[PDB]
Amino acid sequence: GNKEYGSEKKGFLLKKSDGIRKVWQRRKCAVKNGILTISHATSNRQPAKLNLLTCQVKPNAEDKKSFDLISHNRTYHFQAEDEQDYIAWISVLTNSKEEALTMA
């Protein structure tokens, strides 16, 4: 189950753009200390920090690779590399939030 994973992870996620062009774009992502850090395309720009206490993971109904991360002012649309990395990301995000709640 979720205990097959820890509460930290460094990797990449596909993040869907929006507007005239909606495409998947690879971004460096990391989870640590209850925070999801999402890098921008430009690598010297300060990354977005999402407090996982006030976010909700919504796995995809269908494809076992896509998931949303609902934050207070935005929904991020993510896609993992495959089934197994999807399970890893969602498990780590979950674990991180649970740990953060214990400590709050």
Ligand SMILES: CCCC(=O)OC[C@H](COP(=O)(O)O[C@@H]1[C@H](O)[C@H](O)[C@@H](OP(=O)(O)O)[C@H](OP(=O)(O)O)[C@H]1O)OC(=O)CCC
């Ligand atoms: C018009 C001139 C300005 C310009 O550069 O316009 C040309 C752009 C192509 O640019 P892009 O590289 O696709 O830009 C990305 C998207 O806006 C994406 O939605 C955004 O994520 P988010 O902000 O929604 O999450 C990314 O931010 P980070 O992920 O890095 O934060 C951002 O890098 O559009 C076109 O292809 C033209 C037709 C629309």
